[PDB]
From a paper:
Many folds, spanning all levels of complexity (fibrous, solenoid, toroid, and globular), clearly originated in this way. β-Propellers offer an attractive model system to study this process. The units are arranged radially, with their strands perpendicular to the plane of the toroid, and have a right-handed twist, hence the name ‘propeller’ for the fold and ‘blades’ for the repetitive units. Since none of our single-bladed PkwA constructs were folded, we turned our attention to another highly symmetric β-propeller of the WD40 family, found in the C-terminal part of Npun_R6612 from the multicellular cyanobacterium Nostoc punctiforme PCC 73102 and referred to henceforth as WRAP (WD40-family Recently Amplified Propeller; ACC84870.1). WRAP, which we identified during a systematic bioinformatic survey of β-propellers, was particularly interesting in that its 14 blades are practically identical, having acquired only 10 point mutations over 563 residues (6 of these being Trp → Arg mutations at the same position of blades 1, 3, 6, 10, 12, and 13), as a result of 13 non-synonymous substitutions at the DNA level.
The 2-bladed construct behaved as a single species in solution, but size determination by SLS and analytical gel size exclusion chromatography did not allow us to unequivocally distinguish between a trimeric and tetrameric form. Instead, the packing of the blades within each fragment preserves the geometry of the 7-bladed parent, and the tension due to the mismatch between the number of blades in the assembly versus that in the parent accumulates at the interface between the fragments. In the two 8-bladed propellers, the one formed by four 2-bladed fragments absorbs the symmetry mismatch to different extent at the four interfaces, leading to a slightly oval shape and an approximate two-fold symmetry.
Residue numbers in the entry:
A (entry chain B), D (entry chain B): 6 to 82
B (entry chain A), C (entry chain A): 6 to 83
Write the structure that this text describes.
Amino acid sequence: VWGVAFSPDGQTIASASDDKTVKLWNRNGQLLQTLTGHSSSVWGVAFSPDGQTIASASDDKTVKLWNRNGQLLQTLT
Amino acid sequence: VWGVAFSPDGQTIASASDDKTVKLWNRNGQLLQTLTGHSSSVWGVAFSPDGQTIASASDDKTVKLWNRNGQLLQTLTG
Amino acid sequence: VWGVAFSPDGQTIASASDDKTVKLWNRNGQLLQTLTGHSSSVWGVAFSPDGQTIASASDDKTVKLWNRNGQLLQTLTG
Amino acid sequence: VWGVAFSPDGQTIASASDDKTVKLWNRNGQLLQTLTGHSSSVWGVAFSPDGQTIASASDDKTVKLWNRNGQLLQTLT
C-alpha cells in the first residue's frame, strides 16, 4: 500500500483523494473511475499482481477490494 | 499506515487490528488467522518473498515472525 | 511517509522536498533532476514498472506524471 | 519504503527502531547490525533488488544508503 500507485502494466494510476474516494486515471489524463464507499479518509491504495483488483485502506479501519471496472468486491473489517 | 500488507501473489491480506492482533484474510473476504501475542499497538506488517512468513512490528519494541498457518516462530528484540 | 520511493531496478531514488519539488537521485548520491510545478506540499511519489515515469501526489489536489528526464507529461485532476 | 521489510532472499529482516536506528536481524533471531547516523526518528526502510544495499528514511529529512555489512554509503539531503 502506498497513497499513489501505477498498475503493473503502467497504463492506470490510482490515488487516494481528499474526499474519501480513490481515483483511477489512464496515463493520458482521462479519469476512469471514482471508488466511493469508505466512511473516512483513504490513505493507501494497491494493485493486485494481474492489475485486475484494487485494494484501498482507510481511517474507517477497513480494507476494501474493488474490480478495476469500479465494482466493490469485499470489505475486510 | 504500515499496518496493512498484501502477499506477493495477491492471495493473502494482513491487517493490524486495534486489539493488538494481526488478521490474515484471503482475497475472497474470509478470515484465515488471528495472530495474538504483541502487548502494545501493532504498527507494521510485512510478508516474506514467498508469502509464507509474516513479520509484525509493535510499540512493545519487538518484531514477531509468524508462519501463515498462525504459528509464532521468533520474537526479535533490538 | 509516501514521500520517498525507489525505482524497481534500485538505480534511482525519488524524494519530496519541503520546497514543493521532487528530487531524483542516482544510488551514487548524485542529484539528477528537480521536478518543479506543484503549488502545495508533495506527499507521495511512485515509479512506473520500468522506472521511466514518476508520479507525484500533492495537497494541491493534483497528481503529476513526469518522465525521468525531468519533462512534465500530465496533470491529473479528480 | 515500509517501517519493516524482508530482504529479497527472506533471510534478513530490517526494522525502524524507536531510538533513531535501523536494526537488521537474521530470520533465526540473531541481531546482525544496528545502523546509527540519523538525527531524528527513522520511519522507513527498504532493500535494493539484490539485497546488498539498505535505504532508510527519517524525520531529519534525509535518506541514507547503507551496505548490509553496516557501512554508511550515501546521505541524500
